[PDB]
Design a protein around this ligand. Structure first.
Ligand SMILES: CCCCCCCCCCCCCC(=O)OC[C@H](COP(=O)(O)OCC(O)COP(=O)(O)OC[C@@H](COC(=O)CCCCCCCCCCCCC)OC(=O)CCCCCCCCCCCCC)OC(=O)CCCCCCCCCCCCC
Ligand SMILES: CCCCCCCCCCCCCC(=O)OC[C@H](COP(=O)(O)OCC(O)COP(=O)(O)OC[C@@H](COC(=O)CCCCCCCCCCCCC)OC(=O)CCCCCCCCCCCCC)OC(=O)CCCCCCCCCCCCC
Ligand SMILES: CC[C@H]1c2cc3[nH]c4c(c3C)C(=O)[C@H](C(=O)OC)c4c3nc(cc4[nH]c(cc(n2)[C@@H]1C)c(C(C)=O)c4C)[C@@H](C)[C@@H]3CCC(=O)OC/C=C(\C)CCC[C@H](C)CCC[C@H](C)CCCC(C)C
Ligand SMILES: CC[C@H]1c2cc3[nH]c4c(c3C)C(=O)[C@H](C(=O)OC)c4c3nc(cc4[nH]c(cc(n2)[C@@H]1C)c(C(C)=O)c4C)[C@@H](C)[C@@H]3CCC(=O)OC/C=C(\C)CCC[C@H](C)CCC[C@H](C)CCCC(C)C
Ligand SMILES: CCCCCC/C=C\CCCCCCCC(=O)O[C@H](COC(=O)CCCCCCCCCCCCCCC)COP(=O)(O)OCCN
Ligand SMILES: COC(C)(C)C/C=C/C(C)=C/C=C/C(C=O)=C/C=C/C(C)=C/C=C/C=C(C)/C=C/C=C(\C)CC/C=C(C)/C=C/C=C(\C)C(=O)O
Ligand SMILES: COC(C)(C)C/C=C/C(C)=C/C=C/C(C=O)=C/C=C/C(C)=C/C=C/C=C(C)/C=C/C=C(\C)CC/C=C(C)/C=C/C=C(\C)C(=O)O
Ligand SMILES: COC(C)(C)C/C=C/C(C)=C/C=C/C(C=O)=C/C=C/C(C)=C/C=C/C=C(C)/C=C/C=C(\C)CC/C=C(C)/C=C/C=C(\C)C(=O)O
Ligand SMILES: COC(C)(C)C/C=C/C(C)=C/C=C/C(C=O)=C/C=C/C(C)=C/C=C/C=C(C)/C=C/C=C(\C)CC/C=C(C)/C=C/C=C(\C)C(=O)O
Ligand SMILES: CCCCCCCCCCCCO[C@@H]1O[C@H](CO)[C@@H](O[C@H]2O[C@H](CO)[C@@H](O)[C@H](O)[C@H]2O)[C@H](O)[C@H]1O
Ligand SMILES: CCCCCCCCCCCCO[C@@H]1O[C@H](CO)[C@@H](O[C@H]2O[C@H](CO)[C@@H](O)[C@H](O)[C@H]2O)[C@H](O)[C@H]1O
Ligand SMILES: CCCCCCCCCCCCO[C@@H]1O[C@H](CO)[C@@H](O[C@H]2O[C@H](CO)[C@@H](O)[C@H](O)[C@H]2O)[C@H](O)[C@H]1O
Ligand SMILES: [Fe+3]
Lengths: 91, 273, 62, 39, 71, 101, 92, 180, 60, 56, 39, 60, 60, 60, 60, 39, 39
């Protein structure tokens, strides 16, 4: 009954959302800040802009192709049947 | 001895039982009534463990093995040399762990703290109580408990898992594992972030909550914030123990077949049966 | 040709020496606040002796 | 802490009690040896 | 006992009542649907004398055992 | 979304803030509670404006004035409910003896 | 994962596997303890940990005393995060 | 006579006993870090971190949440202590740090930390009064004052938070005693 | 010897004593009850000529 | 002899004592209840010469 | 804190209650002994 | 020699000593009780000529 | 060499020395008690000619 | 050479040295004790030509 | 060359050097101790003509 | 800390205790040796 | 921290103690070699 600090009843919002402070070169912030009411009730509310740079961009390209090869081999192994691709997915 | 700021905190009051009678310290330790019952059960349980080692085949620490009774004894106390000793040690363990949680509640009340720590520990006590009380009771014999021995209890874990052919397929176990792994990741990130703002490279100013918040938001895309990460770490660590209790209590009492064949319901959903 | 000594055992004692070194280091860090202890017999340091209290440089203005 | 006079007084009890305990233990070994010698 | 309507907000008592009756109804239906005798979706057209009855005593053969031999 | 004051119970259709012209005891109770709160909320908002005018911080004065106007608008919404329930209270036989507003 | 333990004769007896488990469990112990500790003093600003590290308030003092009085020794508001960091790192 | 407490007896592990009102003197769970720096906490850009929301126009209540301003505060003895008239916000991680309560029984406004407020029904409905379990409505009159009304030092934060923390032991005599 | 009660708080030396004796008594009873010779609850009515005696193997 | 109640507040002893004796009585009954010779719920009607004896 | 005459009053009850309990327990053992002796 | 009690508080030494002696005695009793030769609860009534002895080296 | 007691507080060194010697003594006794030749609680009464000896290199 | 003791505090170096020598000695003793040739607690009484020797190069 | 001690603190370098050498020596010793050719504790007395040698034949 | 006269005084006891300890250990080893030599 | 004259006084003890230790260890290897040579 004593307040347990597990949930926040009253959030506050700022009309502007904070940005990144410094060193914008060889890479730039994508997007812009927005607020989630659910995330703001678990914890802090701003779903932010994000940073990649050269290493981040290349990481996603390599990692996408890896995941694409995994998924296409899984899907080929049930004969391209999209129902079996979902039904059997964890096997 | 006391911390340099400690003395003004050492007031009377905040006990649940006993009042002023045990409301004192011994070195660093707070005693209290549940301190007295803690030491009683710890001592009785530990000496009965040493007695279990003495009448067993070796003093080798790794190999000592105080085993529960045969299943034929059901819910009765077995002969002490035939597993009844494991039963008495289990009562001491339950008494010691319960006394520890209530002593934590008395300490927290004395400091004006919330009750979060006693209840978080209750998650671990729930898992232990599931393993030695609830699951063996639902199966109808105390002999389903695990043995007290540093490696022999790992033999029990191995054999219980293979009682269900492929225990990885237990769905509550998959959740419990995911909580344990996610907890360890989250703990490494929280530790790293606080240390990296408080211990920046030489000649850099001390960091700030804003820098921590910015960096974290590039890791997960969203800000968790200061209280949020401690809520998350508590949710993950205690949820891991709760889902562990669930995964073992459903194995035997409720599901008896191999765990892979539980997934037959997913294969037979009507959209794709 | 050593029968008892094997690489897994050698590695494990290597780890134990590191780990007991690590616990010492962490217990030195744990004493940067609240130490030395007050006692009726004067100050006490425990063991290991703590690392000294840090002073923190604040952000110059902002 | 203690005065050196208080240290002398305690030392008297402490040495006497230590030796008394060792005397009782030496008799216990005399009895144990008589019953079942270990060498 | 109509003073019970003074103790509580009547809108909330109806919500609780409807919940209790709905849940108890589903409990009793799925219990019956799991039984042999009242598996009505499969065996509902059987006559009352044809419907299953739980055995008063199973037989045995002395060498047979339902469970493996234990320790 | 759930409304603030009935919250979880709005999923079950309990919704006592809604504009009500018939007499209803539940809405009257709610309106008496929300009038007192909103009168105090207006009183706070104009104290806040006076303080910020004393400090003279123009963008804060602008927002405090906007907040006060909004607080007045919400109070007027509850006073409208209070009066229309008052009209019904006079004629529906079972209704309260005390005024709603 | 299961077949690897079968082939190599039960990975429970690998002592580095046993160590990894101890650190995996210890990471759950620590984040439960530390998460609960900071929420128990969050009524006093204990969650503002950087401020508590640079400018020790009663929230840091009470969390140090809770563990000292419970188990006989304590960390600091900073050094608890070192314990956390190492227990996680040593798992893998 | 100005030492705030004395040993209960001479044995090594004995508790201390407060000589005065421990909520005000700051002993036991009412104590604060008396050495703590008497300056405001600052943001990354060097502005005051914790300020009344009235003094930062970018802040606002989230649309789905109750506005606490104007709500009554119910103290530990179930009496009305006052009403909320202002919010104080943390500007580094946007949140409400304190309510400011206009006392019903006097002229003071006092701060009330958010961690000491419980909402009715855990906030699932009602959302129309604040519950303060820690202190009685009379004890609100002694909540420590801040030197200014637009900022709060790290020392004042410790004093105010410690005062409410002490009430869980000291607000009523029975709270100190065992349950059995 | 009464100076013990000046060094130590008698209220809690005596709790420590009663705790120690209770633990010790329970340990000894559970040890004897674990033995064969002194399982009195089941073999207590045997006379000493009937009571178990442990020996090593005859080592022929 | 009565002065132990000046050291120990009796109302706080008596609650502790009752708990200790309640547990002790439960432990002793269960130790007997699952012994062979004293499992009275199942063999209490035997009579003293027919009751088991743990000889071996 | 309790006065010495309050302590003396309680002590009389506490002795009498303890001894009454021990007396009842002794009769219980007499019945148990008669039904099935343990020596 | 008595100045050792200026260096150490006797009130702390007696706690350390009693703790050490208590554990040491329990260790030695349990070690002996786990032995074959000194398992005195089962075999204490045997004469010293009858008590177990561990294996000799064989002569060849 | 007495100025080692100005480098180090003797009160601390003696606690560390007492700790070290206790652990070392227990280690050595437990090593010997684990051995065959010096399992003295079982075989202490054997003569030096009778005590176990570990095997030699085999002759060619 | 002595200026090393200005770069390092002799109080730390001497405790580091004692700890190093303690660990190193224990490592060498336990490695030897685990060997066949130098398991001196079991086989110390063997003469130098009787003590175990590792197998030679294979011969065919 | 001595500018190296201006770039890096010798106090930090000396610890890293001793750490590197100690690890490298321990690695090399235990690698040799694990070999057949150089397992010197068991076979150090053999003499170079009868010390083990790894298998020759690429073929035949 | 200590004054150097206190350090000088303490050392004399420490040396004598170390000697007395080594002497008792020397007798213990020669008893052990004559009971069961290890070389 | 030490003055250079303190470092110089410490150095001579440290060197002498090291060489003393190495001398004792040299005898230990002389004894061990005489009992069971490793080459
Ligand atoms: C997980 C594994 C385990 C658990 C493992 C993990 C836990 C490990 C714990 C480690 C030890 C913690 C020790 C500690 O906290 O001490 C605090 C104290 C602080 O300094 P202090 O503040 O100055 O000390 C207090 C003292 O000045 C005043 O004490 P006080 O007045 O408050 O209380 C009295 C004492 C008891 O009194 C005595 O001991 C003196 C009795 C007279 C002895 C006369 C000689 C007799 C000879 C007979 C010969 C024989 C005749 C035949 O303590 C208390 O009152 C304690 C609180 C009440 C009792 C608690 C409830 C117990 C109930 C159950 C019963 C338990 C029975 C064991 O420090 C000291 O006193 C100095 C250091 C003491 C070390 C003690 C431990 C030594 C262990 C040695 C291990 C050796 C291994 C081989
Ligand atoms: C498995 C992987 C993960 C496994 C993960 C395991 C993590 C374990 C982490 C925690 C272990 C340390 C606990 C601790 O620091 O307690 C405080 C105590 C005292 O120092 P202090 O607190 O700074 O100062 C207070 C004291 O000086 C004066 O206090 P007071 O006068 O009020 O009270 C009397 C004294 C008497 O002293 C003692 O009784 C100390 C006895 C400590 C025995 C247990 C050592 C366990 C080492 C485990 C690491 C490892 C040892 C090999 O003080 C006290 O009463 C203090 C009571 C503290 C009770 C702590 C009980 C902890 C039991 C932990 C058992 C863990 C079993 C795993 O510290 C100590 O006595 C020394 C501890 C030194 C750190 C361990 C480093 C070991 C490195 C290897 C050996 C180094 C040889 C030179
Ligand atoms: C200390 C031990 C614990 C630990 C630690 C740990 N893990 C970590 C970290 C840390 C400290 C990180 O900092 C890092 C991280 O980023 O955390 C958020 C990470 C991490 N731990 C991860 C997972 C993980 N950690 C695990 C475990 C643990 N991590 C341990 C318990 C496990 C387990 C238990 O199995 C997993 C699965 C990742 C979430 C993350 C590392 C992420 C990473 O490397 O991603 C590489 C990128 C890809 C795989 C590609 C994704 C592609 C997408 C499909 C998008 C495609 C977009 C587009 C089509 C292409 C691009 C186009 C361009 C034109 C833009
Ligand atoms: C719920 C999430 C995780 C969790 C949390 C958690 N644990 C906690 C806490 C919290 C929040 C505490 O506050 C509490 C604490 O004080 O920590 C310092 C604790 C604690 N977690 C501990 C351990 C622990 N936690 C574990 C697990 C977990 N703890 C969960 C994963 C494990 C595992 C998985 O193995 C262990 C070993 C202790 C350090 C401590 C509780 C201390 C306590 O209860 O002390 C009193 C009792 C004793 C000192 C000894 C009792 C001895 C018995 C009488 C005899 C022995 C019987 C025993 C059953 C034998 C077992 C043999 C084994 C080889 C099988
Ligand atoms: C944060 C960092 C912490 C690090 C802490 C240290 C912990 C762990 C590192 C352990 C490395 C283990 C090496 C394992 C391989 C091994 O033992 O293989 C041995 C050869 O011997 C060897 O290799 C000898 C190995 C000696 C080990 C010396 C110290 C550790 C070296 C690594 C340090 C890294 C630092 C960065 C072969 O064994 P076998 O059984 O086949 O032999 C008999 C065949 N009949
Ligand atoms: C399996 O085999 C393994 C185990 C492996 C083998 C190995 C074993 C090993 C290594 C064993 C080591 C043992 C050991 C080593 O030294 C053991 C050492 C034992 C010792 C030292 C015992 C000392 C006992 C001392 C006693 C009892 C003192 C009593 C004091 C009394 C009564 C007086 C108190 C004061 C009074 C009353 C007055 C106060 C006055 C005051 C205050 C005033 O006047 O002011
Ligand atoms: C398996 O075999 C194993 C288990 C292993 C074998 C071993 C077992 C062992 C070791 C057993 C040990 C047992 C033991 C050891 O001591 C057991 C000890 C038992 C004891 C001490 C029992 C004491 C009972 C006391 C009672 C009941 C008192 C009642 C008092 C009453 C009712 C009055 C209270 C006062 C009032 C109401 C005041 C009114 C007036 C007022 C206020 C006014 O007038 O103001
Ligand atoms: C696998 O290998 C395995 C099998 C394990 C084998 C290998 C084992 C190994 C490597 C062993 C190594 C052993 C070793 C190495 O150094 C061992 C070194 C041991 C040492 C140094 C022992 C020293 C003991 C000293 C003692 C006891 C001193 C006592 C002093 C007393 C009593 C007096 C105190 C002062 C008083 C009373 C005066 C107060 C005055 C005051 C205050 C005043 O005047 O103010
Ligand atoms: C299994 O086999 C594997 C392991 C595989 C094989 C391989 C093994 C390997 C690689 C081994 C490596 C070994 C090694 C490498 O470096 C070994 C190096 C060892 C060393 C450096 C030893 C040094 C010892 C020095 C000592 C003892 C100094 C003592 C000093 C004393 C006593 C004096 C103290 C000061 C005083 C008294 C002054 C007070 C007065 C003051 C202050 C005043 O007056 O001011
Ligand atoms: C192939 C990819 C696999 C990814 C797997 C991801 C699995 C994720 C499953 C998330 C399930 C969450 O499920 C949620 O678990 C928590 C665990 O605390 C339960 O919560 C439980 O524990 C908490 C403590 O933490 C108690 O306070 C609570 O009373 C209890 O119910 C919730 O009742 C349950 O709803
Ligand atoms: C005459 C009919 C008029 C319209 C009736 C509308 C009926 C609506 C559905 C009723 C049943 C819903 O289900 C019922 O919901 C109530 C809502 O409090 C739950 O009630 C319980 O849980 C809720 C949260 O879920 C808690 O806030 C509440 O305090 C507790 O009593 C019951 O446990 C559940 O059984
Ligand atoms: C088997 C044991 C073999 C010998 C072991 C090693 C210890 C030998 C000690 C006795 C021999 C003399 O040893 C010598 O002592 C003197 C003081 O007495 C030390 O001298 C030290 O203090 C003196 C002042 O007192 C300084 O001037 C000197 O520079 C400093 O080194 C020497 O450093 C040491 O070499
Ligand atoms: Fe943290």
């Amino acid at each position: 009954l004593e307040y347990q600090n597990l949930f926040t009843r009253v959030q506050v919002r700022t009309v502007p959302e904070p940005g990144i402070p410094i060193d914008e070169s060889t890479g730039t912030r994508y997007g812009t800040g927005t607020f989630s009411y659910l995330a703001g009730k678990f914890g802090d509310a701003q779903i932010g802009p994000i940073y990649l740079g050269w290493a981040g961009v290349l990481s996603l390209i390599f990692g996408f192709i890896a995941i694409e090869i995994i998924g296409l081999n899984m899907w080929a192994s049930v004969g391209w049947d999209p129902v079996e691709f979902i039904r059997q997915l964890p096997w | 001895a006391m911390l340099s700021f400690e003395k003004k905190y050492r007031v009377r009051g905040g006990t649940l039982i006993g009042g002023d009678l045990f409301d004192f310290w011994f070195g660093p330790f707070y005693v209290g009534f549940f301190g007295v019952t803690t030491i009683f059960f710890v001592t009785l349980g530990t000496l009965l463990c040493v007695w279990g080692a003495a009448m067993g085949p070796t003093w080798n620490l790794w190999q000592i093995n105080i085993a529960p009774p045969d299943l034929k004894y059901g819910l009765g106390l077995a002969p002490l040399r035939e597993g009844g000793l494991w039963q008495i040690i289990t009562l001491c363990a339950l008494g010691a762990f319960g006394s520890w949680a209530l002593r934590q509640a008395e300490i927290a009340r004395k400091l004006g703290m919330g009750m979060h720590i006693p209840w978080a520990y209750g998650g671990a006590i729930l898992a232990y109580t599931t393993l030695v009380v609830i699951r063996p009771f639902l199966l109808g014999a105390w002999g389903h408990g695990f043995p007290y021995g540093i490696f022999s209890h790992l033999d029990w874990v191995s054999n219980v898992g293979y009682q269900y052919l492929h225990f990885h397929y237990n769905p509550a176990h998959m959740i419990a594992v995911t909580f344990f792994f996610t907890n360890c990741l989250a703990l490494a990130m929280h530790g790293s972030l606080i240390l990296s703002v408080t211990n920046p490279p030489k000649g850099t100013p001390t960091g700030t909550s804003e820098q921590e918040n910015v960096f974290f938001r590039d890791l997960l895309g969203y800000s968790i914030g200061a209280i949020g990460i401690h809520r998350l770490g508590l949710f993950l660590a205690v949820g891991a123990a709760v889902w562990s209790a669930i995964c073992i209590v459903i194995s035997g009492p409720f599901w008896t077949q191999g765990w892979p064949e539980w997934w037959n319901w997913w294969l037979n959903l009507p959209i794709w049966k | 040709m050593m029968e008892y000594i094997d690489g897994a055992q050698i590695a494990l004692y290597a780890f134990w020496l590191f780990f007991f070194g690590l616990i010492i280091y962490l217990r030195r860090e744990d004493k940067r606040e609240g130490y030395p202890l007050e006692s009726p017999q004067g100050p006490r340091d425990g063991w290991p002796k703590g690392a000294p209290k840090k002073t923190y440089v604040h952000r110059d203005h902002g | 802490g203690m005065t050196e006079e208080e240290a002398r007084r305690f030392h008297g009890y402490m040495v006497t009690g230590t030796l008394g305990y060792v005397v009782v233990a030496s008799v216990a070994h005399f009895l144990a040896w008589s019953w079942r010698p270990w060498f | 006992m109509h003073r019970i309507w003074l103790m509580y907000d009547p809108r909330r008592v109806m919500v609780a009542l409807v919940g209790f009756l709905a849940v108890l109804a589903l409990v009793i239906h799925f219990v019956l649907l799991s039984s042999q005798r009242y598996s009505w979706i499969e065996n509902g057209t059987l006559g009352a004398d044809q419907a299953p009855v739980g055995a008063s005593a199973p037989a045995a053969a002395a060498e047979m055992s339902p469970l493996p031999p234990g320790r | 979304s759930v409304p603030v004051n009935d919250g979880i119970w709005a999923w079950y259709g309990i919704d006592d803030d809604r504009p009500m012209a018939a007499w209803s005891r539940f809405h009257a109770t709610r309106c008496v509670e929300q009038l007192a709160i909103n009168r105090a909320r207006v009183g706070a908002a104009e104290w806040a404006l006076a303080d910020v005018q004393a400090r003279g911080i123009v963008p804060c004065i602008a927002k405090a004035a906007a907040h006060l106007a909004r607080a007045r608008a919400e109070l007027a919404d509850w006073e409208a409910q209070g009066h229309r329930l008052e009209a019904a209270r006079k004629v529906t036989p079972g209704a309260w003896t005390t005024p709603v507003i | 994962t299961s077949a690897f333990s079968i082939r190599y004769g039960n990975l429970y007896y690998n002592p580095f596997h046993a160590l990894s488990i101890a650190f995996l469990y210890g990471s759950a112990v620590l984040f439960a303890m530390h998460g609960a500790t900071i929420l128990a003093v969050a009524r006093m600003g204990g969650e503002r940990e950087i401020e508590q590290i640079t400018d020790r308030g009663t929230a840091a003092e009470r969390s140090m005393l809770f563990w000292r009085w419970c188990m006989g020794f304590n960390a600091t508001m900073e050094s608890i995060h070192r314990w956390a960091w190492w227990f996680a790192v040593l798992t893998t | 006579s100005d030492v705030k407490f004395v040993p209960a007896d001479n044995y090594n592990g004995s508790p201390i006993i407060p000589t005065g009102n421990p909520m005000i003197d700051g002993v036991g769970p009412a104590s604060w870090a008396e050495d703590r720096r008497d300056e405001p906490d600052l943001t990354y850009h060097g502005s005051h971190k914790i300020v009344p929301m009235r003094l930062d126009p970018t802040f606002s209540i989230a649309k789905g949440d109750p506005d606490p301003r104007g709500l009554p505060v119910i103290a530990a003895d179930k009496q009305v202590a006052g009403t909320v008239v202002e919010l104080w916000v943390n500007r580094s991680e946007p949140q409400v740090s304190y309510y400011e309560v206009q006392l019903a029984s006097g002229e003071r406004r006092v701060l009330l930390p958010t961690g000491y407020v419980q909402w009715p029904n855990f906030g699932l409905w009602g959302n129309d009064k604040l519950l303060v379990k820690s202190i009685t409505a009379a004890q609100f009159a002694n909540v420590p004052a801040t030197k200014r009304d637009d900022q709060i030092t790290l020392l004042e934060e410790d004093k105010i938070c410690a005062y409410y923390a002490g009430g869980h032991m000291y607000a009523f005599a029975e709270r100190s005693q065992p349950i059995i």
